[PDB]
Structures are given as structure tokens and as C-alpha cells.
Write a protein that binds this ligand. Structure first.
Ligand SMILES: [Zn+2]
Length: 197
């Protein structure tokens, strides 16, 4: 919550989310930009700047098989980011934005404490809500996982903070004191270098 850091985030729109907005790049771009602007506000307290390295859209076909099983898709996506994306665009983290309905209760997924990692700095997000604050909180939540944050346990003194385990319809734009600690722990214990520049 103190070293001035920066995440160059890259967004990937899959073919199902492309078709859901009637194959229109402008609607998708503006939709995604509003949500990202909200993410920035959420993160300025941690002194962390989010920058969009770009937005890629799989307009013709999906570059990976997007499965309803979140687990598989996250792994398929991270691998594709390693071997393909990173050769074309430089980014500290990429987040797939899909219209596929993941199996079960899940609306997003990320790897814990992997920010900057060439193989694992990724997240998955289901376009499950039309309310931009809800989507921005979903995006901020998975990014929070890559940055080392766990979910807020009842013994965290917050049920509507960003890292709450399930989405609240009237969320706070705040990180609990547990989330701040996980983050300090990630900074000191993991020493993510890419974020400090
Ligand atoms: Zn979570």
C-alpha cells in the first residue's frame, strides 16, 4: 500500500463476447474502458497505477478452446499468453474477458501471487453483469489474487470489500485490512520486479 507501482494490463476479448456485442469493436472498447477507469480508482489507495497495454479481440476465431470449466480455461489462457501474446505485446498481466458461462458459481478466476510471471500472470473474467462497478470489482478481484490476496474471512472485518468471497450487489470499492497485509506480504516476500517500473 505504499511503493508507487504500475501494472500494464492487457485485455483479451474472446469470440463469444465479440458476438454478444453484435461484433462491434467500439461498443466493446468503450465498455471495457469504463470498467478499467473504475479499477484505477479502486487501486490508487495501494499506490498502484493500472495502464492498458491494449485490447485484443478474437474477431474471427478463438485462439484457445474457451471451456465452461474455469480451471481448464485459465490454464489454456496462461499458456497461450506465454507462447503467443508475450512475443507480440509486452504486459505484466493479461485478463481474458468472455461471455461463456463458467460451470457452477464462478464468474472469474486467477492464479495466486503470480503477478509478473511469464507463465502465470493471468486472470479470467465472465462478462456476467451489465453494471460496470460490478464488472470493475470482478476485474479488480482476480487482479487482487495475482497480487497475493486471499478472500476476506469473516474474521477480516469486511463483507463488502473487494476480496469478499462472493459478489455483493452494492460493493465497497475498498480493500480490507487483510487484503492490505497480503499485499505487503507479496511485495516483501515475492519481490515482483516488473511492477516497480
Ligand atoms: Zn476470489
Amino acid at each position: 500500500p505504499a511503493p508507487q507501482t504500475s501494472i500494464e494490463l492487457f485485455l483479451i476479448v474472446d469470440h463469444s463476447m465479440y458476438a454478444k456485442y453484435n461484433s462491434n469493436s467500439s461498443k466493446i472498447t468503450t465498455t471495457l474502458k469504463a470498467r478499467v477507469n473504475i479499477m484505477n480508482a479502486i487501486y490508487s489507495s495501494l499506490n498502484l497505477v493500472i495502464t492498458l497495454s491494449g485490447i485484443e479481440m478474437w474477431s474471427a476465431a478463438d485462439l484457445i478452446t474457451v471451456q465452461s470449466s474455469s480451471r481448464n480455461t485459465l490454464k489454456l489462457f496462461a499458456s497461450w499468453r506465454e507462447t503467443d501474446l508475450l512475443k507480440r505485446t509486452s504486459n505484466d498481466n493479461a485478463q481474458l474477458l468472455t461471455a461463456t458461462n463458467f460451470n457452477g458459481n464462478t464468474v472469474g478466476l486467477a492464479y495466486l501471487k503470480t503477478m509478473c510471471n511469464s507463465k502465470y500472470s493471468v486472470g479470467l473474467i465472465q462478462d456476467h453483469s451489465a453494471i460496470p462497478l460490478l464488472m470493475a470489482v470482478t476485474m479488480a478481484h482476480e487482479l487482487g489474487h495475482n497480487l497475493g490476496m486471499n478472500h476476506d474471512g469473516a474474521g477480516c472485518s469486511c463483507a463488502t470489500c473487494i476480496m469478499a468471497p462472493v459478489l455483493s450487489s452494492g460493493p465497497a470499492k475498498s480493500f480490507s485490512d487483510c487484503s492490505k497485509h497480503d499485499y505487503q506480504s507479496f511485495l516483501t516476500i515475492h519481490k515482483p520486479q516488473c511492477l516497480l517500473n
